[PDB]
Design a protein around this ligand. Structure first.
Ligand code: ICS
Ligand code: CLF
Ligand code: CLF
Ligand SMILES: [Fe+3]
Ligand SMILES: [Fe+3]
Lengths: 522, 477, 522, 477
């Protein structure tokens, strides 16, 4: 039943007595559900150390992974160029899933097309699909550039992107002058960050490789910035603002911040802003190229050093205090522009925040996961605050990245209890947080379920989740936040310290039981 | 109105396509005529999408793993292949269930084989077998395994049925191989078909020789209800008040035991004809179980459906049906009295997958709201035969509508509300039109039954009459 | 006992068995504590409507007030001018309390002096104290200006500020040309916002009243902005940024954002930034003067219209969409500068956020409290979102403000269940939230206890608190947030929607009981 | 270090003051000599502050309401006057307690008369009587009412003792008027004195004729412990393990019943001599109860104090004291072994109120840390008499030190750590020096006893050796 004045959604409508009775009747009659004591015993067993060893003995089964496939990163890279349509050669289900993922994260329209290859394409290839798709896309959505990536179907059947695009141009399906950069993005290799890297390398090669004769390094007095797979608009904004404050000419390649943050004024803008083709063409003339996330931009680094002849600096991701400082020093050295007083004041403000919150941040144990550059930057920042990262997990990381993170940890006394796991999933992390309980988790929305499991063991065993990373589905507008630079560090510090304080307030709200510590001032 | 105006609009929208694409798309757009009962002469459906036109359709893997097999809670479903599909489809569908996740229920978890280059080159049958071993090791309370194939599995020639048979024999467990490669078919409909065939071949007939279950003359099985936000529950309770016994529930909050016990029921109540008509017809031929379609959207449709179900049983069930209708009359009458004045005269455009574009029309009309256009992602010509009689004259019908097409149709028609998926939501919100997700109920619900009608009306009023839609224009512009 | 590897603070050290037993025997032996059933019955009685009726019959007793006294606002106003020392004439305990309050809110050094008037000054006055204090302050801390306010002791004994300052100047204790503006701030009149108004009026009169002969309105092509009692640095920053984006010359009077946000670079800056004396002197030359918080700037408005001859516009606080639009239009009309496209884009982005979060924000019931302008702006914004303010409380509001808020509420269908209370305290609000439970509270840290009280009645009766306002003691760095303009609206919207989502996640975390609605995507 | 350098520093700091202020402040700064016993010959304390010098001192209302009367939980304390006083002092002091807030305990609550213009002009005695009636109506479980006067109450002709007398006689309740007007005295010390006189006059002697309480030769009363962060609790348990019975603790987590029962105890254990030596001496004179000081800061002071209290009793208590010392020896030994190497050689400077500047020196020395400077906001000459023999040679002593003075001294001596209140915390933090709040224990604690020693060492280590202090200089500047 429903009351017209107070209508209940699923929660709490299904906790009504009639619904509870009907559910119990269904379960007792036709489910053949295991007895509750058996369920509790099995859950308790899954919370033990022997189950953890059995879980870490996994080699073939992946449970709750923390990575996506390459064409997702390829689409994100393609969305960062002016009037550019992402075009995934293969099946349309992949494109539907990519659009759903990006829509649920950004809450913004995401444009992407496919040529909808079917079994006929599996038997005879997808050249006709590519031709018809390019013609239809250009005729309908009128893009200035079509950026082609691939699904696994095309990669397995070995579709030749170069031959297909060339034949489409020669047969007149698209104009010969129309830019159609392409990239092979096999989903069985790497993750979405690798797809972003491949797509960027393809676009840069298309716009540069044949025009290196007239290029002189340092001619346009600019610095190239390659952001990589980035899902926080605040990071693009903060990098642009910091470079503008220092008085440094720059060219931010693959900037999607406008198309993912369009205004709601009564009209739908399919394209908005983005890196221009002139910027891509003039990129080799820059002084140098800086990769914000070098641990998944290796192919781009190889192409830039080999072709553009740019001495790409060895810089970590500009996260935290020391690494942001190093990035600023390097950019000042390359450009010759001194660091202004505004950035010094912002850095001092961040240090003041650290000194204010150090008493609450010290000694906290965190289990964190995400992308390699993001994870290593977060670990560095946590070590800057006196926190103790305990379980560091990166599903798409490699051995070199693990060695670098181990070297970072060995440089701080707060990293003595830290262990880095690569190739592991969130079920491994569930076992780890059950056996070696940290104070908090840091990661994407998928960690919420883990917290639920911990709360089933007990309130004293619950591990609260802090949502930093990608994707965040259960919260609104967190994608507008910043993680890079001093502003990003300030945001992360505020979020962490307030999470600690909120948990402490929750634990001491019990009246006449634990409220002696329910302090007004913290 | 103005059928000629609608036809001219269709022509003007189609003008931008190339010749072949325009010719193909002309057959998928139509002006409704209720007198016509053969939609094949009016529209075409269930055909391949035009390349590079930003379609909204999914794949067969979405229709099998995400739609049919996924809600089954006591089963472990392995997304056999690369990591992307299971990750994108993990917990994206609000098929509600009751259970301890990770111990006896596994709906919201992502099991995958995580194919690498080595698995592509050398195969993955050994990986699949030893993965089944690990699954039995770590999840002892699972009541069966399904293996949903992705595109490479069909491409590289992995022999998964043999592996499933051998491993199931060796562990005395039900292992169901499903060949739901995304390149098969043109949409999720073939995924539905493949999942139904898998259920028929490997699960449904396991208790053919078992005559232990006690049967009553009032045994019904709810087929094709996936418990989005709880809809199935909101329906089942009504069937419980009518005196019927719901033995099985497919597949939302469904158990493999319910699927096994289904052939023992006396009647099948198919909610989603599109997804499970295959299994319903197979049950009709093999076991003699009659089936009927029903609709619980809005007071009128739910009352008519309850009377129709009561007609297939004795007089006691009819008396109980009249009792339940009388009991629930004041609630929906009050809901109508509160919300119909706020929604009188509002025009709606719909675009959902294969059932809801026609099932929700009655609920909208119960609030005095008229639908000026509908369409389907993947429906067949029988679905259009059904919906063409449920719309008014000179209303727009679209099959596999593209983003540009749908946007232009809205710009011309200018409805007060649009109901579609997440991929159209923000597009249409930025154009200043209220939007409701008709797949996930915009993270609200249920909408089925008398309890769901109140939620539906409240959501429609809160979105249609929200102040935010009056502030899109800057006062200085 | 303590474990050297895991040392426990008060919580949870006092939850140990020995401590619990020692508390038990203490209570049973020597406390003569009332029986527990008596305590529960009395608490339950305090949660009823009859207790509410008795509570609202209060005439002489104030329990848990939500306001401070005038000299606090006077000190905050004085801190906003260049190298200006706040000087409170009276007792030093007041200055200690003011400094402690401001340090606990801003987590920053706060400078203020007193003349330490004692019993003798009650029979002789504070002339000698004023002279010696002015001399000592100028000699030691070297300010360019000393802004004098008063405590209640001086107000009750009727110390003449003008005569005291004039005599101190005449007798050589301070130079005759040294600016010493003064203001009477009786603590038994109004609240801290009234003190801010009085102090600003005193400073403006001191710097203008005798030099209005050569002043011409609109000669310097600037717009004066009077912020009022403000405790969010982000609002100063956002007003500056919005006026700079518009290309509008402005003079922000009483700007404390720098001295309250100094960097931590190894040196202590007692003074930082602030409004200059030249700006104060040239203020009459401005085109017009805009009061951001008119409901506590009435005396300043009277002085500005009477002396400066400025036609102060009738503008509400620039909180939320419509009022920010009105403020921007008025500034454009006054200055002749058209609104740029950046502000239009920011407004459209705020509207997009509203359209994204409207489903979760609609119908929510809020009990909010704070200052009059802040409360009315928050109510307006909540009505823009489709939310329902139910208990609107303003301890320092008046009848005209109540009428204005009632007119605002009557202009929206969402204000049908809204009641405005003036002169009430937080005990009244506790009764209200017990008898007519809202979904959330919005207010300062003092509301946390109310939440605790509600949690004692039951988890289904708990009312979560959202910390917007002043003061915030139990959280860190919230004073850096923004409440004005589109940026402030975005921050408020994100905070509200995420509070709703966090409460929903907490309510549906129980396994096999309420987890069916524990959706990954919201 | 280098006595002559310290005098030169004192002179250089003093040069900036005018002649009167410089002459006054010269008497409040001293170079400590442990041989000197009479502190009157070196430093002058408990004098009026110089106007306009940014002192840290509070008022008598803070010393009475905030310090003595406030922690009493079952009493309702009315801040009679304008609204600011209670609001600034509400829950600012971490005197912990156990109770149902708003029902049987009222510590974190703010009760005030909220004086307006009409109350200043025409008085507030009638408002006071009405307020007492409302308090009795709305809080029936309160066990007494105190009325703390603010500045206007003393200034205007309010007569609150008469009102308290009549209302208490009518209501059969204890109503205690306290004249703690902030202009009385020069600091919180006179507030302490006035509160002690109020306790003596109105509360302490109510059970003089009552002899129903059972007495034990091991009855002790904790005096001057206000349970900051649970400090008193961490002490009481130790006194419970020695075989003693603690009838009362004043006043943190204190009840009016404990205050009434105190004249029945056999020994008084005065923690804070400065605040409640008056009541201790009055009890000694009137009831013959001996009193003695104790120190539970650090293992050495705690062990010495426990041995002294045991010596005040018979042989069994001494034996139990030996067992408790042996039982707690390994714990603090492990704490020392873990934390002393990380804190060896660190120099500290302290500026706290009346007791803590000297009471915490032993704990720092137990970790190998030297106090090079100390001072008091409001102490008397006896506190300094104790401090000189507590401190080392050539260390600085300051009384009512000003902000400029303290900053200059810190910049010259350059300590590794500073312990003071909130008003100096951020000032010294921006200069790049670790800071610990010694009033509220920086929202940590307890620091008393063996359990508190671990927390003290951990806090000192985490603040002293924090990385944040190594990052105040930008690499480019
Ligand atoms: S009462 Fe006194 S200032 Fe003895 S007024 Fe003050 S809780 Fe201090 S050095 Mo705050 S004489 Fe207590 C004190 Fe010491 S408030 Fe606390 S820390 S031991
Ligand atoms: S049509 Fe459907 S969703 Fe597409 S792959 Fe095929 S089953 Fe799957 Fe999978 S890993 Fe990524 S998302 Fe594809 S490119 Fe392959
Ligand atoms: S020295 Fe002490 S704290 Fe000061 S007033 Fe006097 S008793 Fe109180 Fe009170 S309301 Fe405000 S804070 Fe004062 S000006 Fe009066
Ligand atoms: Fe959006
Ligand atoms: Fe600070």
């Amino acid at each position: 039943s429903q009351q017209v004045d107070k209508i209940k959604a699923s929660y709490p409508l299904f906790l009504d007595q009639d619904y509870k009775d009907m559910l119990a009747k269904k379960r007792d009659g036709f489910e053949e559900k295991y007895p509750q004591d058996k369920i509790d015993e099995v859950f308790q067993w899954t919370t033990t150390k022997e189950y953890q060893e059995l879980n870490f003995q996994r080699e073939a089964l992946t449970v709750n992974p923390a990575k996506a496939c390459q064409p997702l990163g390829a689409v994100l890279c393609a969305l960062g160029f002016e009037k550019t349509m992402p075009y995934v050669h293969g099946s349309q289900g992949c494109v539907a899933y990519f659009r759903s993922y990006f829509n649920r994260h950004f809450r913004e329209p995401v444009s992407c097309v496919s040529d909808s290859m079917t079994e006929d394409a599996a038997v005879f290839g997808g050249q006709q699909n590519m031709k018809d798709g390019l013609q239809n896309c250009k005729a309908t959505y009128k893009p200035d550039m079509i950026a082609v990536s691939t699904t696994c179907m095309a990669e397995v059947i070995g579709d030749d992107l170069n031959a297909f695009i060339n034949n489409s141009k020669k047969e007149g399906f698209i104009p010969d002058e129309f830019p159609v950069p392409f990239a092979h993005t096999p989903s069985f290799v790497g993750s979405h960050v690798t797809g972003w890297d491949n797509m960027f390398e393809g676009i840069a090669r298309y716009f540069t490789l044949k025009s290196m004769d007239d290029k002189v390094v340092g001619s346009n007095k600019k610095i190239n910035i390659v952001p990589g797979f980035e899902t926080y608009l605040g990071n693009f904004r903060v990098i642009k603002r910091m470079l503008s404050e220092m008085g440094v000419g720059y060219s931010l390649l693959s900037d999607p911040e406008e198309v993912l943050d369009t205004p709601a004024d009564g009209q739908f803008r399919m394209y908005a802003g983005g890196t221009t083709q002139e910027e891509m063409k003039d990129a080799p003339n820059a002084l140098n190229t800086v990769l914000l996330q070098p641990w998944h931009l290796e192919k781009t680094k190889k192409f830039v050093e080999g072709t553009w002849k740019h001495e790409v600096p060895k810089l970590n991701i500009p996260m935290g205090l020391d690494w942001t400082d190093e990035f600023l020093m390097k950019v000042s050295e390359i450009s010759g522009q001194p660091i202004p007083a505004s950035l010094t004041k912002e850095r001092g403000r961040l240090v003041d925040m650290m000194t204010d919150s150090h008493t609450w941040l010290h000694g906290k144990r965190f289990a964190l996961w995400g992308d390699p550059d993001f994870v290593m930057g977060l670990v560095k920042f946590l070590l800057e605050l006196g926190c103790e990262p305990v379980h560091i997990l990166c599903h798409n990381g490699n051995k070199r990245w693990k060695k670098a993170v181990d070297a970072i940890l060995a440089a701080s006394p707060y990293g003595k209890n830290a262990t880095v796991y690569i190739g592991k999933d969130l079920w491994h992390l569930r076992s780890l947080v059950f056996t070696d309980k940290p104070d908090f988790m840091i990661g994407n929305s998928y960690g919420k379920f883990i917290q639920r499991d911990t709360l089933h063991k007990g309130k004293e065993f619950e591990v609260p989740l802090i949502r930093i990373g990608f994707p965040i589905f259960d919260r609104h507008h967190l994608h507008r936040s910043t993680t890079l630079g001093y502003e990003g560090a300030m945001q992360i510090l505020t979020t962490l310290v307030n999470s600690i304080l909120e948990r402490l307030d929750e634990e001491t709200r019990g009246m006449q039981a634990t409220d002696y510590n329910h302090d007004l001032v913290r | 109105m103005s059928r000629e105006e609608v036809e001219s609009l269709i022509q003007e929208v189609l003008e931008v396509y190339p010749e072949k694409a325009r010719k193909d798309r002309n057959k998928h757009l139509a002006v409704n005529d209720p007198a016509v009962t053969q939609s094949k002469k009016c529209i075409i459906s269930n055909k391949k999408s035009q390349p590079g036109l930003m379609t909204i359709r999914g794949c067969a893997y979405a229709g099998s793993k995400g739609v049919v097999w996924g809600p089954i809670k006591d089963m472990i479903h392995i997304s056999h292949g690369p990591v992307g599909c299971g990750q994108y489809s993990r917990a994206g569908r609000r098929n509600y269930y009751i259970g301890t996740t990770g111990v006896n229920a596994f709906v919201t978890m992502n099991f995958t084989s995580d194919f690498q280059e080595k698995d592509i080159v050398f195969g993955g049958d050994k990986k699949l077998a030893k993965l089944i071993d690990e699954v039995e090791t770590l999840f002892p309370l699972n009541k069966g395994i399904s293996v949903q194939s992705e595109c490479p599995i069909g491409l590289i020639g992995d022999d998964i049925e043999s592996v499933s048979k051998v491993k199931g024999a060796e562990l005395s467990k039900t292992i169901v191989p499903v060949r739901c490669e995304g390149f098969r078919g043109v949409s999720q409909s073939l995924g539905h078909h493949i999942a139904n065939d898998a259920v028929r071949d490997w699960v449904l007939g396991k208790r053919d020789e078992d005559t232990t279950f006690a049967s009553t003359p009032y045994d019904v099985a709810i087929i094709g209800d996936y418990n989005i936000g709880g809809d199935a529950w909101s329906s089942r309770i009504l069937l419980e008040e009518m005196g019927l016994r719901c033995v099985a529930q497919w597949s939302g909050d469904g158990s493999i035991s319910e699927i096994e016990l289904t052939p023992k029921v006396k009647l099948n109540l198919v909610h989603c004809y599109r997804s499970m008509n295959y299994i319903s017809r197979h049950m009709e031929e093999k076991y003699g179980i009659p089936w009927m379609e029903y609709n619980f959207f809005g007071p009128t449709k739910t009352i008519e459906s309850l009377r129709a179900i009561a007609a297939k049983f004795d007089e006691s069930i009819q008396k109980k049906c009249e009792e339940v209708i009388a009991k629930y009359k004041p609630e929906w009458e009050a809901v109508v009295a509160k919300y119909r004045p706020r929604l009188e005269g509002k025009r709606v455009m719909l675009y959902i997958g294969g059932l809801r574009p026609r099932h929700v029309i009655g609920a909208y009309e119960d609030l005095g709201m008229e639908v000026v256009g509908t369409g389907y992602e993947f429906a067949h010509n029988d679905d259009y035969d059904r919906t063409m009689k449920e719309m008014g004259d000179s209303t727009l019908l679209y099959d596999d509508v593209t983003g540009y097409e749908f946007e232009e149709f809205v710009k011309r028609i200018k409805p007060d509300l649009i109901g579609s998926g997440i991929k159209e939501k923000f597009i249409f919100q930025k154009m200043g039109i209220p939007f409701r997700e008709m797949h996930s109920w915009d993270y609200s619900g249920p909408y089925h039954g008398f309890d769901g009608f109140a939620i539906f009306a409240r959501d429609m009023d809160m979105t249609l009459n929200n102040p935010c839609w009056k502030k899109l224009q800057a006062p200085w512009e």
